[PDB]
Amino acid sequence: IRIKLRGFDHKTLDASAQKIVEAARRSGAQVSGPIPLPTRVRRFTVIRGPFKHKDSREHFELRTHNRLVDIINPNRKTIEQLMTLDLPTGVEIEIKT
Amino acid sequence: GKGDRRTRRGKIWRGTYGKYRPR
Amino acid sequence: PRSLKKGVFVDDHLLEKVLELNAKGEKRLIKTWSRRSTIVPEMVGHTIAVYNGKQHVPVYITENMVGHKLGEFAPTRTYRGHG
Amino acid sequence: ARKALIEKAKRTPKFKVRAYTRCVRCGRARSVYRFFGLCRICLRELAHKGQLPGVRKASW
Amino acid sequence: GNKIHPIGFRLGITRDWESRWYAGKKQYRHLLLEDQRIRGLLEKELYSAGLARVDIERAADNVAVTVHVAKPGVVIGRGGERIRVLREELAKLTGKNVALNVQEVQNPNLSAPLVAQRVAEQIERRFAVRRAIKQAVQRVMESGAKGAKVIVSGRIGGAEQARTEWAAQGRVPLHTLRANIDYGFALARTTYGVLGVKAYIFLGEV
RNA sequence: CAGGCCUUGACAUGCUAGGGAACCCGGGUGAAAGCCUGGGGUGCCCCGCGAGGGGAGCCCUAGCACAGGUGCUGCAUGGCCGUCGUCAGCUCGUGCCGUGAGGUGUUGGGUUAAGUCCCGCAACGAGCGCAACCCCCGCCGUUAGUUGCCAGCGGUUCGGCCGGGCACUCUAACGGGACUGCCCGCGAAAGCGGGAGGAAGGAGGGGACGACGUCUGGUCAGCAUGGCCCUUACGGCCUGGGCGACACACGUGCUACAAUGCCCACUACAAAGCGAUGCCACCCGGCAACGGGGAGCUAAUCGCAAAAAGGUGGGCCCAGUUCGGAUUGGGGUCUGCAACCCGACCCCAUGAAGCCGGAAUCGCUAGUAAUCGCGGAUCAGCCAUGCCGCGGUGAAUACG
Ligand SMILES: [Mg+2]
Ligand SMILES: [Mg+2]
Ligand SMILES: [Mg+2]
Ligand SMILES: [Mg+2]
Ligand SMILES: [Mg+2]
Ligand SMILES: [Mg+2]
Ligand SMILES: [Mg+2]
Ligand SMILES: [Mg+2]
Ligand SMILES: [Mg+2]
Ligand SMILES: [Mg+2]
Ligand SMILES: [Mg+2]
Ligand SMILES: [Mg+2]
Ligand SMILES: [Mg+2]
Ligand SMILES: [Mg+2]
Ligand SMILES: [Mg+2]
Ligand SMILES: [Mg+2]
Ligand SMILES: [Mg+2]
Ligand SMILES: [Mg+2]
Ligand SMILES: [Mg+2]
Ligand SMILES: [Mg+2]
Ligand SMILES: [Mg+2]
Ligand SMILES: [Mg+2]
Ligand SMILES: [Mg+2]
Ligand SMILES: [Mg+2]
Ligand SMILES: [Mg+2]
Ligand SMILES: [Mg+2]
Ligand SMILES: [Mg+2]
Ligand SMILES: [Mg+2]
Numbered sequence A: 001i002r003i004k005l006r007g008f009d010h011k012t013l014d015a016s017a018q019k020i021v022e023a024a025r026r027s028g029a030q031v032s033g034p035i036p037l038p039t040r041v042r043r044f045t046v047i048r049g050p051f052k053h054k055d056s057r058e059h060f061e062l063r064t065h066n067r068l069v070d071i072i073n074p075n076r077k078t079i080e081q082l083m084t085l086d087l088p089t090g091v092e093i094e095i096k097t
Numbered sequence B: 001g002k003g004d005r006r007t008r009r010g011k012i013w014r015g016t017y018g019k020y021r022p023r
Numbered sequence C: 001p002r003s004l005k006k007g008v009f010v011d012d013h014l015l016e017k018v019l020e021l022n023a024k025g026e027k028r029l030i031k032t033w034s035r036r037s038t039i040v041p042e043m044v045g046h047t048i049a050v051y052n053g054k055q056h057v058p059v060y061i062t063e064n065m066v067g068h069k070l071g072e073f074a075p076t077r078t079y080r081g082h083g
Numbered sequence D: 001a002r003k004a005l006i007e008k009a010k011r012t013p014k015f016k017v018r019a020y021t022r023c024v025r026c027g028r029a030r031s032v033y034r035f036f037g038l039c040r041i042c043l044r045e046l047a048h049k050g051q052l053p054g055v056r057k058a059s060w
Numbered sequence E: 001g002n003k004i005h006p007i008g009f010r011l012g013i014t015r016d017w018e019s020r021w022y023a024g025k026k027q028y029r030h031l032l033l034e035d036q037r038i039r040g041l042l043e044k045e046l047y048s049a050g051l052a053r054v055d056i057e058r059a060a061d062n063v064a065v066t067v068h069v070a071k072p073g074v075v076i077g078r079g080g081e082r083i084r085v086l087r088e089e090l091a092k093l094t095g096k097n098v099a100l101n102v103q104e105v106q107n108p109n110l111s112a113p114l115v116a117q118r119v120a121e122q123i124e125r126r127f128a129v130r131r132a133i134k135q136a137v138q139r140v141m142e143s144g145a146k147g148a149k150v151i152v153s154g155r156i157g158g159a160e161q162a163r164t165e166w167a168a169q170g171r172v173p174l175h176t177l178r179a180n181i182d183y184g185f186a187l188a189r190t191t192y193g194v195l196g197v198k199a200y201i202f203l204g205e206v
Numbered sequence F: 001c002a003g004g005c006c007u008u009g010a011c012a013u014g015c016u017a018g019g020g021a022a023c024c025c026g027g028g029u030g031a032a033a034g035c036c037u038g039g040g041g042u043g044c045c046c047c048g049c050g051a052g053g054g055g056a057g058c059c060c061u062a063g064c065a066c067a068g069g070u071g072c073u074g075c076a077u078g079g080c081c082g083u084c085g086u087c088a089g090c091u092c093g094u095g096c097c098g099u100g101a102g103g104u105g106u107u108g109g110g111u112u113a114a115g116u117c118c119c120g121c122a123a124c125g126a127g128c129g130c131a132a133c134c135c136c137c138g139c140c141g142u143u144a145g146u147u148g149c150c151a152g153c154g155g156u157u158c159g160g161c162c163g164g165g166c167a168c169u170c171u172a173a174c175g176g177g178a179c180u181g182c183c184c185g186c187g188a189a190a191g192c193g194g195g196a197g198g199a200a201g202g203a204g205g206g207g208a209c210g211a212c213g214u215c216u217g218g219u220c221a222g223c224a225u226g227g228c229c230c231u232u233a234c235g236g237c238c239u240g241g242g243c244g245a246c247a248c249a250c251g252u253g254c255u256a257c258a259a260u261g262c263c264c265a266c267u268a269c270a271a272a273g274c275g276a277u278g279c280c281a282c283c284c285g286g287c288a289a290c291g292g293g294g295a296g297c298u299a300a301u302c303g304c305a306a307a308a309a310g311g312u313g314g315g316c317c318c319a320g321u322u323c324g325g326a327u328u329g330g331g332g333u334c335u336g337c338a339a340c341c342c343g344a345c346c347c348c349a350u351g352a353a354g355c356c357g358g359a360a361u362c363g364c365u366a367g368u369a370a371u372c373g374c375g376g377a378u379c380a381g382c383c384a385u386g387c388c389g390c391g392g393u394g395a396a397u398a399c400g
């Protein structure tokens, strides 16, 4: 079972990944560590002024950080315990297999 | 040169394919 | 141009005019705005008043102007010259 | 011709090619970003106020 | 064009985002439009309550919304008679579940938006401008802040020629990233036009 | 802009009255908008098996308060921006000097990229600026090993494909490391010169960041806003045209004028990005643009994707040329309701000027210039040779 968690802010995402890794060992299933995936960076470049000043620009970027967690064994006791966790609202999760 | 559509270089410059720049 | 897998385009509001003429007294003076409509061989013999954006120019159709568009026979800019 | 243009753009046209994007904040028709739906001016204003999540000043 | 936005400069270093949620390419703009609608609606609702900060927080089809005001009772009311009402319309304005929270500001003198709003309100009352700026800066400095600055721009006192009047005390290191500087802005719509009010409050370095 | 049309209006609250609408498929005329149009249905609270009447989501007609204006004023303004100028400055409290404007501090000496620091001094201190705090690159360490990688081992249809491993590269979080820290010399000191070690040495390279103020600087057409002006029109809708004109003049670019080159075939080596009315593998048909089937991929998995300059081999042999690719004729593909005015691309034919450019003028000090290709935003399509980024190859010179 593979859990992929993404977020805009890396600190809360890392905290969620560490929480998942730590809690997954309550009923140990040979936990596979939280691995980081390549951050995806979207860039936007705007003219600074409202009118006619093309040579002045401002750069903005939006980054998506991605982490992956795997459990080798199912561990149903530890699986149903993962339903109600402490998930920061900025962290978006996805479970799959 | 790069302005000629009937060459590999010209098709590369225009970013297209054809008889002269096959894919 | 248009692809031959598609048919030659007529607005179907001017085509109805020439078609209805062809069996009901087939010669009159039609005013149209469909400059994008393609001339058809059936349209030969008609005088069509085509909008140039300001006025309707009368165009008398012949054989050697069948595949063109109506708008090519109503110039839209008046130039003359400089001076 | 500002309010009517905004509302007309918000309306469904007879042909699909007559639909164009406008800024959902000030109604601008030029330089409207698909990701946000906002024009560059409104995007800069909202980004400087911290109201665009994850959006930060870029420097590399 | 001279100065960068003090808050935007320090995002992710000292300041924190006002909206905190994650969305992909398909849902970002619709949630963003909803956030702007919510903030605009609440701005003209709790103006007399002293609305400083509005935070939007979304988990899954549910939005938190925490507001920070000078007088929580002005938002809640008698037994929540208004607190529920402002919530219900919000749901009817969002089509989701909302959890509107109210927070009190410990020091209204240390919140730059509130200082700027107060100065703008006084300017609208045809008060003297220079005295207002001096008094507001002195009030801020009286509450332990390490520095304060207030700037007003426009037709000060109805004059035909626009001017700028500013007052400052202490330290305002705008070039220091570790400095925790709160910025606030307000508009004054007087019979002769619009005046801009800016407030900088320095609260020490983290 | 021309013509055809609408009137409390395409958008917002409210007072009425007559209908009571609310929501949905058809008829004539018209280029369309529009105008005249033909068939059904409102919840909810009611007296209630009653004809029915009442308050209510909501709509239309006739009146109003009114909406609307990219109409004028950036010499009424907010906000934001450009500029002097990333220049090294601009000030303040108290004290002291001067009738006063004002001065001192902030001047002098040494030093620095720096009002940077040191010394001296009727000044003693402080603030905004400088620097630092933040990001990227360059060296190493810990946490981890999937979709990443494959040193050792065993298989193998010869692809990490598999088992297996996290050694290595890499990915992304946290740390260390560089601080004149050490030695010699110079000097009151700050500091300057030299050396060792170190991936990195004197601010390590590049970003983000723009003081008090100046310019009656720019923007009422991004938005907001004072005043003025219009109100069956300076408002609103549609069709068509124009913004693409063309005796000329200027700015910024692209492509060349060739052999350190051009053409053809084979063969290598990147980075950063984008992708669900999407990216499209592969196969088939057409010389081709492309079309028809049709996997995989909501994507470190699948695709765009071919990198090009390069390397190897051959052809051209100094010509307006196998240089150069403008202009025009013809045949087509695709997007779009629709490529005439006014799209892009493919194929055939045409093959212009141009032989290195007058007075003059511009950029650039190192992974820079030059040169080569690649991606992205906007976007149905594209007039992008633009803009913002990315990497490959890689100089010359600075005496002064
Ligand atoms: Mg008009
Ligand atoms: Mg479009
Ligand atoms: Mg648009
Ligand atoms: Mg001005
Ligand atoms: Mg201005
Ligand atoms: Mg100066
Ligand atoms: Mg003094
Ligand atoms: Mg005296
Ligand atoms: Mg000075
Ligand atoms: Mg002086
Ligand atoms: Mg400097
Ligand atoms: Mg200093
Ligand atoms: Mg600095
Ligand atoms: Mg390891
Ligand atoms: Mg002027
Ligand atoms: Mg002007
Ligand atoms: Mg305006
Ligand atoms: Mg105005
Ligand atoms: Mg133009
Ligand atoms: Mg033209
Ligand atoms: Mg120019
Ligand atoms: Mg030129
Ligand atoms: Mg060119
Ligand atoms: Mg030739
Ligand atoms: Mg040639
Ligand atoms: Mg066209
Ligand atoms: Mg010649
Ligand atoms: Mg020659």
Ligand SMILES: [Mg+2]
Pocket: F361
């Ligand atoms: Mg010149």
Ligand SMILES: [Mg+2]
Pocket: none
């Ligand atoms: Mg230099």
Ligand SMILES: [Mg+2]
Pocket: F253, F254, F385
């Ligand atoms: Mg060009």
Ligand SMILES: [Zn+2]
Pocket: D023, D024, D025, D026, D027, D028, D038, D039, D040, D041, D042, D043, F222
């Ligand atoms: Zn906008």
